[PDB]
Amino acid sequence: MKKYTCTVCGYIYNPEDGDPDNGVNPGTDFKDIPDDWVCPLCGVGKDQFEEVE
Amino acid sequence: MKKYTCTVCGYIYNPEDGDPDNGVNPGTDFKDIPDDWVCPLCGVGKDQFEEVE
Amino acid sequence: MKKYTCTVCGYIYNPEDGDPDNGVNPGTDFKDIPDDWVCPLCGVGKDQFEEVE
Ligand SMILES: [Fe+3]
Ligand SMILES: [Fe+3]
Ligand SMILES: [Fe+3]
Numbered sequence: 001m002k003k004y005t006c007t008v009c010g011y012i013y014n015p016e017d018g019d020p021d022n023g024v025n026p027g028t029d030f031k032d033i034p035d036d037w038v039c040p041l042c043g044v045g046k047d048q049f050e051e052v053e
Numbered sequence: 054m055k056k057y058t059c060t061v062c063g064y065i066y067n068p069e070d071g072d073p074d075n076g077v078n079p080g081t082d083f084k085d086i087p088d089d090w091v092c093p094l095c096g097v098g099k100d101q102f103e104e105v106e
Numbered sequence: 107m108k109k110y111t112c113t114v115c116g117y118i119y120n121p122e123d124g125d126p127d128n129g130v131n132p133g134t135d136f137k138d139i140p141d142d143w144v145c146p147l148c149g150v151g152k153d154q155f156e157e158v159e
Contacts, residue, residue, distance in 0.1 A: 018141070020141035020142065021141070021142060022142060023140035023141060023142040023143070024140070024141075025137075025138070025140060025141050031078075032078070034076035034077070034078060035071070035073035035074070035076060035077075035078050036073065036074060036075060036076040037076070084131075085131070087129035087130070087131060088124070088126035088127070088129060088130075088131050089126065089127060089128060089129040090129070
């Protein structure tokens with residue numbers, strides 16, 4: 001599964017790690033993250049993220 | 054996947070659209086919506102919804 | 107699917123029942139519960155739960 005980066009602040013979503021404190025378990029692909037989740041560091045939505053190719 | 058209607062207000066849950074602002078992604082069948090979700094328009098629970106046949 | 111017990115208070119998570127009022131639908135295995143869920147009775151996190159063998 002691919003990493004995604006927050007293009008506003010640089011946070012990297014790593015699917016192996018998830019974002020458990022916000023209910024995103026390890027192993028969650030970015031597309032499957034609920035669409036109301038926000039960047040943990042900066043608070044922006046998923047639409048400011050981009051895949052890391 | 055089937056549409057569901059809120060029998061209190063008439064809102065239609067369309068699985069192709071989801072309810073992303075409340076964390077329900079496009080492609081979520083109604084049964085899989087977390088059971089604490091409420092109608093976005095009127096605030097009632099899932100138990101007031103019915104399948105659109 | 108296995109039951110899990112809250113080792114702090116004794117609450118039993120039964121996957122057939124879920125915890126619907128907190129968005130955990132019936133049929134959710136414990137591992138798949140979002141990692142920010144807490145014991146409904148006592149408020150502690152998943153890390154204080156143990157499988158019932
Ligand atoms: Fe960010
Ligand atoms: Fe409604
Ligand atoms: Fe407990």
